[PDB]
Design a binder for this molecule. Structure first.
Ligand SMILES: Cc1occ(O)c(=O)c1C(=O)O
Ligand SMILES: [Mn+2]
Ligand SMILES: [Mn+2]
Length: 176
């Protein structure tokens, strides 16, 4: 309940609506799976932030319905030649001409990185934590230092807000 209020109070309403929709399409109640709700919001926000700090360098795939995501991915592949992924990535980088998978973890960045790399094949991976750590494919961080730094500050602030409201301990030990 406190976690549900936190989410509504600290994410802009478009992120909340997107996260909510996603969950109840797949039979998940955001009032029950409150840690999941908050993680979905958090990840979505990072994806939007990462896109925004780009002229139009990044195409946003996360946050669309699957029809549109797959329409976007299909369209990108036919006009670039880049191999088509098996899972929907998060962004396309039109400068580096590669898909990006964004991860946001409350565990060690190397652990989650492995877990994503294993789950994927030419998709660039960029992991962020709530501690100001990141790990990215070939240590290529894609973004400039200021953009990365704004993302990390936002993540650390979510963490501390949660901790203000005694939600961090639950959120940290849970898993999306
Ligand atoms: C489903 C899912 O879970 C965690 C992520 O970081 C994702 O990007 C993702 C997805 O939409 O593919
Ligand atoms: Mn995604
Ligand atoms: Mn992701």
């Amino acid at each position: 309940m406190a976690m549900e209020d936190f989410v509504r109070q600290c994410f802009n309403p478009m992120i909340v609506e997107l996260a909510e929709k996603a969950m109840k399409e797949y039979g998940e109640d955001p009032k029950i799976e409150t840690n999941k709700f908050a993680a979905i919001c958090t990840h979505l926000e990072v994806c939007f932030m990462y896109s925004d700090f780009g002229k139009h360098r990044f195409e946003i795939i996360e946050g669309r319905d699957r029809i549109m995501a797959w329409t976007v991915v299909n369209s990108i592949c036919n006009t670039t030649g880049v191999e088509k992924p098996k899972f929907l990535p998060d962004l396309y980088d039109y400068k580096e001409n590669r898909f990006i998978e964004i991860g946001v973890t409350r565990r060690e960045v190397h652990i989650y990185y492995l877990e994503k790399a294993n789950k994927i094949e030419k998709t660039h991976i960029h992991i962020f934590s709530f501690t100001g750590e990141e790990m990215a494919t070939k240590a290529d961080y894609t973004l400039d230092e200021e953009s990365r730094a704004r993302i990390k500050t936002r993540l650390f602030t979510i963490r501390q807000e949660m901790a203000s409201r005694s939600l961090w301990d639950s959120f940290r030990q849970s898993e999306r």
